[PDB]
């Protein structure tokens, strides 16, 4: 196994990775900012290194400080987690170049998928169904651009190639808005990503957000581990995730799944990864690929039995996948509620000290969090402070366990979205299943 690794992250995911390392007998190096000396995973790590002050640019995005920490402790690999440098190709490249293993794919694979246009071209070539679109970047010729939009059919969406999530994109519903919308998306992309390249896709009006978890090793094995529905969201921020997706038949699962596995072979993918799709009218349309472990990975683990973080560490060490595709079975159902330190009226981060904490327990209840009684949530990082994942023999049992768990959960001293999560679990449309990406925002309205 890897002897010792640097966990280049913080919070729940850093604790998640630390647990996996200890199971595997891997030594841990917890790199942390000065604000994060009292993190749960830091206090459990074999070795700790303070890599800088609170703001991320000087700590968790500080490439030299992180690599220097790996050098001085004699670590052999770096896990980026999610959300920081985890999809930074230059970082992965620099890590590989410095002599350490980057837990993830090759740097060139990271930048292929970090460029949305070329990612789409790669997937379309490999046989993955995509959104009807421009099939290339848009130029400055508005006659060409209008012809592309006519061919696609209004409404259309303009997207930044260097973009991702909700950055940066606008819907165009007629010719009259097209030129200005391309210009505005370009300007925003140039400012944000130093990449003004944009593409066009047919705008899907009411889709679901269904994504496929994959694993691929260094010995030619590539598997899919079913799907996740992530439609319960607000402004490109996932709120509830669940596995498998309601309404997806075993035969739809293998259809799209096998196509994702083949794409991995074609591109020589390595590690965990997620294929993000829009699902509408029984049809899958690829939009982007995440080349890292995701926040919502625990729901896939519950229903397959596969420890994805352990697999990442096995792959990085040159072990094959511990599971064959024929041995991957979907059993039961899992729901994840993100727990955020946020104000219920503004949805702005609400940091501060937790005065009382109690975690829920029981059969099928998994609590993924670093928080404890007396812990202070800092203002410098993301608002998500924990993940409640509940598993049942079916969807209704999973939701029923979630409601129970949410009621056992005590987090005093700070504002949370626990009451909102309770409302969603009690929502009749959610309880039916299959709600689109716009549902939560219109329920909140």
Ligand X SMILES: COc1cccc(OC)c1-c1cc2cnc(N)nc2nc1N
- Least Å from the CB of residue 438 to ligand X: 7
What φ, ψ does residue 287 adopt, rounded to 5°?
-120, -40
- Least Å from the CB of residue 429 to ligand X: 17
310 in a labelled binding site: no
Minimum CB distance to ligand X smaller for 120 or for 399: 120
β-bridge partners, 289: 275
204 in a labelled binding site: yes
Please report, as residue ranges, which positions from 2 to 61 form the binding site for ligand X (by CB under 6 A): none
Candidates 16, 111, 209, 333; binder of ligand X (CB under 6 A) is 209
Please report, as residue ranges, which positions from 264 to 283 form the binding site for ligand X (by CB under 6 A): 278
- Least Å from the CB of residue 256 to ligand X: 16
Minimum CB distance to ligand X smaller for 58 or for 124: 124
Measure the CA–CA gap between 18 and 310, rounded to whole angstroms.
10
159 in a labelled binding site: yes
Please report, as residue ranges, which positions from 285 to 304 form the binding site for ligand X (by CB under 6 A): 287
280 in a labelled binding site: no
Minimum CB distance to ligand X smaller for 188 or for 201: 201
- Least Å from the CB of residue 94 to ligand X: 30
144 in a labelled binding site: no
Measure the CA–CA gap between 174 and 149, rounded to whole angstroms.
9
Minimum CB distance to ligand X smaller for 277 or for 367: 277
Total residues in contact with ligand X, by rule CB under 6 A: 13
Please report, as residue ranges, which positions from 223 to 252 form the binding site for ligand X (by CB under 6 A): 233, 236
157 scored as a contact of ligand X (CB under 6 A): yes
- What is the 3-state secondary structure of the chain? CCCEEEECCCHHHHHHHHHHHHHCCCEEEEEEEHHHCCCHHHHHCCEEEEEECCCHHHCCCCHHHHHHHHHHHCCCEEECCCCCCCCCHHHHHHHHHHCCEECCCCHHHHHHHHCHHHHHHHHHHHCCCECCECCCCCCCCHHHHHHHHHHHCCCEEEEEEEEECCEEEEEECCHHHHHHHHHHHHHHHHHHHCCCCEEEEECCCCCEEEEEEEEECCCCCEEEEEEEEEEEEECCEEEEEEECCCCCCHHHHHHHHHHHHHHHHHHCCCEEEEEEEEEECCEEEEEEEECCCCCCCHHHHHHHCCCHHHHHHHHHCCCCCCCCHHHCCCCCEEEEEEEEEECCCCCCECCEECCEEECCCCCCEEEEECCCCCCEECCCCCCEEEEEEEEECCHHHHHHHHHHHHHHCEEECCCECHHHHHHHHCCHHHHHCCCCCCHHHHHHC
116 scored as a contact of ligand X (CB under 6 A): no
Minimum CB distance to ligand X smaller for 28 or for 231: 231
Measure the CA–CA gap between 132 and 31, rounded to whole angstroms.
44
Measure the CA–CA gap between 403 and 425, rounded to whole angstroms.
6
- Least Å from the CB of residue 423 to ligand X: 20
**Closest to 33 in 3D by CA, of 381, 434, 418, 430:** 381
Candidates 204, 216, 248, 313; binder of ligand X (CB under 6 A) is 204
Written as six digits, the tokens of 35 are 């604000």
188 in a labelled binding site: no
Residue 149: C-alpha distances to residues 171, 195, 204 (Å) = 12, 22, 14
Minimum CB distance to ligand X smaller for 287 or for 354: 287
- Part in contact with ligand X (CB under 6 A); list of ranges 92-100, 199-207, 386-394, 418-426: 199-207
160 scored as a contact of ligand X (CB under 6 A): no
- Least Å from the CB of residue 204 to ligand X: 4
Which residue among the candidates 292, 314, 366, 423 is catalytic per the annotation? 292
Candidates 131, 341, 385, 402; binder of ligand X (CB under 6 A) is 131
- Part in contact with ligand X (CB under 6 A); list of ranges 203-211, 244-252, 335-343, 382-390: 203-211
Minimum CB distance to ligand X smaller for 377 or for 437: 437
- Least Å from the CB of residue 237 to ligand X: 9
- Part in contact with ligand X (CB under 6 A); list of ranges 64-72, 204-212, 293-301, 328-336: 204-212
253 is known as an active-site residue: no
Point out the residue whose Cβ comes nearest to ligand X: 204
Residue ranges for the known binding site are 116, 159, 165-166, 201-204, 209, 236, 238, 276, 288, 290, 292, 295, 338
- The footprint of ligand X (CB under 6 A) covers 131, 157, 201-204, 207, 209, 233, 236, 278, 287, 437
Residue ranges for the known binding site for hydrogencarbonate are 238, 292, 295, 338
Residues identified as active-site: 292
């Amino acid at each position: 196994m890897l002897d010792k690794i640097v966990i280049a992250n913080r919070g729940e995911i850093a604790l998640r990775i630390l647990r996996a390392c200890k199971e595997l007998g891997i030594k841990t190096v917890a790199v942390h900012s000065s604000a994060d000396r009292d993190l749960k995973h830091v206090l459990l790590a074999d070795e700790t290194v303070c890599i800088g002050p609170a703001p991320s640019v000087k700590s968790y995005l500080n490439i030299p400080a992180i690599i220097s920490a790996a050098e001085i402790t004699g670590a052999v690999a770096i896990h980026p987690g999610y959300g920081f440098l985890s999809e930074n190709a230059n970082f992965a490249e620099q890590v590989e170049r410095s002599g350490f293993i980057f837990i993830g794919p090759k740097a060139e694979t990271i930048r292929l998928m970090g460029d949305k246009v070329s990612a789409i071209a790669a997937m379309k070539k490999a046989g993955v169904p995509c959104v009807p679109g421009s099939d290339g970047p848009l130029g400055d010729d508005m006659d060409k651009n209008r012809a592309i939009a006519k061919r696609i059919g209004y409404p259309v969406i303009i997207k930044a190639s260097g973009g991702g999530g909700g950055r940066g994109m606008r819907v165009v519903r007629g010719d009259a808005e097209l030129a200005q919308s391309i210009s505005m998306t370009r300007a925003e992309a140039k400012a944000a990503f130093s990449n003004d390249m944009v593409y066009m896709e047919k705008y899907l009006e009411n889709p679901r957000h269904v994504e496929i978890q994959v694993l691929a090793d260094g010995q030619g094995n590539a598997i899919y581990l079913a799907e996740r529905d992530c439609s319960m969201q607000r402004r490109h921020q996932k709120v509830v995730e669940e596995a498998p997706a309601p309404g997806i038949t075993p035969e739809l699962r293998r259809y799209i799944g096998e196509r994702c596995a083949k794409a991995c072979v074609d591109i020589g993918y390595r590690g965990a990864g997620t294929f993000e799709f829009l699902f509408e009218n029984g049809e899958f349309y690829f939009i982007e690929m995440n080349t890292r472990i995701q926040v919502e990975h625990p729901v896939t683990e519950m229903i397959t039995g596969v420890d994805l973080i352990k697999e990442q560490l096995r792959i990085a060490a040159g072990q094959p996948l511990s599971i064959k595709q024929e041995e991957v079975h979907v059993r039961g159902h899992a729901v994840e509620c993100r727990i955020n330190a946020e104000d219920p009226n503004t949805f702005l981060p609400s940091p501060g000290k937790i005065t009382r904490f109690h975690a829920p327990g029981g059969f099928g209840v998994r609590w993924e969090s670093h928080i404890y009684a007396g812990y202070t949530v800092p203002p410098y990082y993301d608002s998500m402070i924990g993940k409640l994942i509940c598993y049942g023999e079916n969807r209704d049992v999973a939701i029923a366990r979630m409601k129970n768990a949410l009621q056992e959960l005590i987090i005093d001293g700070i504002k949370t979205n626990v009451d909102l999560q309770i409302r969603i679990m009690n929502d009749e449309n959610f309880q039916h299943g299959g709600t689109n990406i716009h549902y939560l925002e219109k329920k909140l309205g």
